[PDB]
Design a protein around this ligand. Structure first.
Ligand SMILES: [Cl-]
Ligand SMILES: [Cl-]
Ligand SMILES: [Cl-]
Ligand SMILES: [Cl-]
Lengths: 243, 243, 243, 243
């Protein structure tokens, strides 16, 4: 049973590869770094049971994954943009940066999803889990460009699900905040940053960052299809920070 | 492991009981019919692993449950109003029916919750899962009193989670629609009533009622605490009808 | 052209009376203090163009108002609870206080609305404007009972609008926060409470409390029926604190 | 006293021009046809008190508008995509069409808003009114691309308002559905399409198309800034179809 995970070295990627591999999936992985054959080999060495794709185009990931299996059971569309770009303000930000924000967080997942429909429908269904952000639903003053691009992909999930769910193709969005992960909250900064630790005590009812295995537990539960009627919505992964 | 499930014979009750007992729980059950001791003996014999309480007051259920075990791991607050009161209109409805709507759907879960905080905190945490309705978030023309009462309890979950999550007491709301259950979508309606399958085809992207085991899968997933960061929010169980 | 404002002395009452009287309305006012006849004549003397009702039951205010005119053009359902109670916690709170929360903020507005439909329909339509709270839509840690009660009435507006709009009976909910009013944010508090000014600088994009005349401007605009297609929704009145 | 209205000949453009001019504004108008000198002269002569711009690039509209007055009081960002591109499906749709959807509905408004910030702040504030769509908040099965692009601009309003409000720059999003307008619901469609009249009867509580003067009343009310604390939110203009 195979899963496709995008941007595997970033954001919720490590968590998704870990939990899905432990669940018995063969995890086929995309990452910008995988254009390099050497980085492909190191990744597979460091992550038993994975396959690293060379393909970089969003519309070609599905065809490239289908080289290593009969069908795709789960796609984790783990879209991200490197820090500090997520905090780019409205004023003075270049048009290139504006377009890149939508390219990485809205156009890339659309082109992926579009390419996926036909093969996934032929296999009788699958799950597509988009990793977005809390600002997909709740706005933040310092994310005035990141927020809009994330909200587009949340709306993509809720609208596209109205039609794809009848094909057995189940779409979901996760909107993390205060989630322990290499892109926005690496374990290295927690101990050194007492403003963060005070921010979490103030704003996160759970009182801690969410753990990689808890993100992994949500992903594997969704991939199992055992609760299919919750298809088509946004799940906050924020320790109670949202709503 | 102890679970308390309220109104066990109705709504989400049977689904919860089947799945929690299958996951190794001892399920302590409340139900109006359990005033009669013979009902209590029959329910227990038909459902291995369950203990039927005689207690009927919402604020005494926790104490009565703690007569059978050291701590409660999960409370399923499975509140409901007999069909067809869920469709009571605004005009011509008695003040007494209006108050009963809030009593069963809004006051009762609050008195339950308030009684549970001290013992659940002292035990190190628990999960408290409120079964509400889709109209807890999205209004429907025929539910102008049922909706308000359900929305209150969804707001209870979202607000009370801000303080209780720090005690390890994890609250959630499930808002079902088109969920195959004896109160609102019994199998008999699916078989007998031509209009229901027509409605589901038009309005439910999944194209079917939600199964009891699928509701059960969600309840036992939440009760495990493996994805604790999703605390404090509303989950649609509608097959894509919401949002 | 007559308007009915409830709890005229508190919350959004003074703003409503002032703006509506300025817009040419004869403002019939309900208030608990009006059970004392001296207070009725003091109120009418201090507020030219008002009528202070003796009536206190919600379901009788409409008939009491039609003693002074042939139709009600606008109802401002200005429900409130005396200040400290909006912060009532779950733990240790008496059943009586819980029930009074719902009585003032959820049952009283329903019983008023129920009583108004037939005369309002007979008169070709009207506007009913419910003054609720920001916590009707966005939860807050310190409002776990006030929140539920307010959310019930916002959902009442959203549900009841689905039928009553066809009668020309236009329902709206306004949800204030940081609104300069005698109940929650008197001008006294702004000068006396440096914490309030810091909190407003931090959390309110507008940077200031909303003015009574701005709340009046919202009310009179809704009462005009000039933008009727926005019927049946919740308007944040928070200086950008919501969403 | 000047306003800028974009795509003046489409969507909410005619409503905004007529109402703003009736209200005493000099309305500077952008439109794709205004590249034709003869179309500019004809529009100006058919619409007394307007000024037609030749400029077509979003980030130059403001400076071109400022050629005619010292300050802009209101900007109506009236963004649209020609029918029936709003119904573009996921499958088979070209990459260029996906990109054009975001260009017209998401990137164009962002580049306009960015260019406006500095001169609007120097004038001590202004109103910026984005005309989006009901699908910016509520998904629809047949708008899986139009929805995401609209949702991004709604999220832009909600996020950008967190900072721009302190400058007196007040942002709002209006989300029409069943709004009588030349692009999506011209009067002739109401006459030629009994399916449309039945859909409105079934789904729109108000029971009719929203009128252009009602959209103009909402725009003109927002432009007055008289109820500034409602800044930074989405207004349904749907006749109760939403929420
Ligand atoms: Cl995160
Ligand atoms: Cl159901
Ligand atoms: Cl207030
Ligand atoms: Cl429209």
């Amino acid at each position: 049973v195979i899963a496709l995970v995008t941007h595997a070295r970033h954001f919720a990627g490590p968590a998704a590869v870990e939990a899905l591999t432990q669940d018995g999936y063969t995890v086929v992985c995309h990452d910008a770094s995988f254009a390099d054959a050497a980085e492909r080999q190191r990744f597979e060495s460091e992550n038993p049971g994975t396959i690293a794709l060379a393909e970089q185009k969003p519309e070609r990931l599905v065809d490239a994954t289908l080289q290593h299996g009969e069908a795709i059971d789960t796609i984790v569309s783990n879209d991200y943009i490197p820090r500090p770009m997520n905090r780019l303000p409205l004023e003075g930000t270049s048009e290139a940066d504006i377009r890149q924000m939508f390219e990485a967080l809205s156009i890339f997942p659309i082109l992926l999803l579009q390419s996926a429909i036909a093969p996934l429908r032929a296999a009788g269904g699958a799950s597509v889990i988009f990793i977005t952000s809390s600002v997909g639903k709740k706005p933040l003053a310092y994310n005035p460009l990141y927020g809009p691009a994330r909200a587009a992909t949340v709306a993509l999930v809720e609208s596209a699900a109205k039609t794809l769910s009848r094909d057995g193709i189940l779409l979901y969005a996760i909107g993390p905040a205060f989630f322990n992960n290499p892109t926005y909250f690496p374990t290295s900064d927690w101990e050194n940053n007492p403003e963060l630790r005070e921010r979490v005590d103030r704003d996160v009812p759970l009182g801690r960052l969410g753990r990689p295995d808890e993100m992994g537990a949500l992903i594997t539960f969704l991939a199992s299809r055992r609760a299919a009627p919750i298809v088509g919505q946004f799940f906050a992964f924020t320790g109670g920070y949202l709503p």
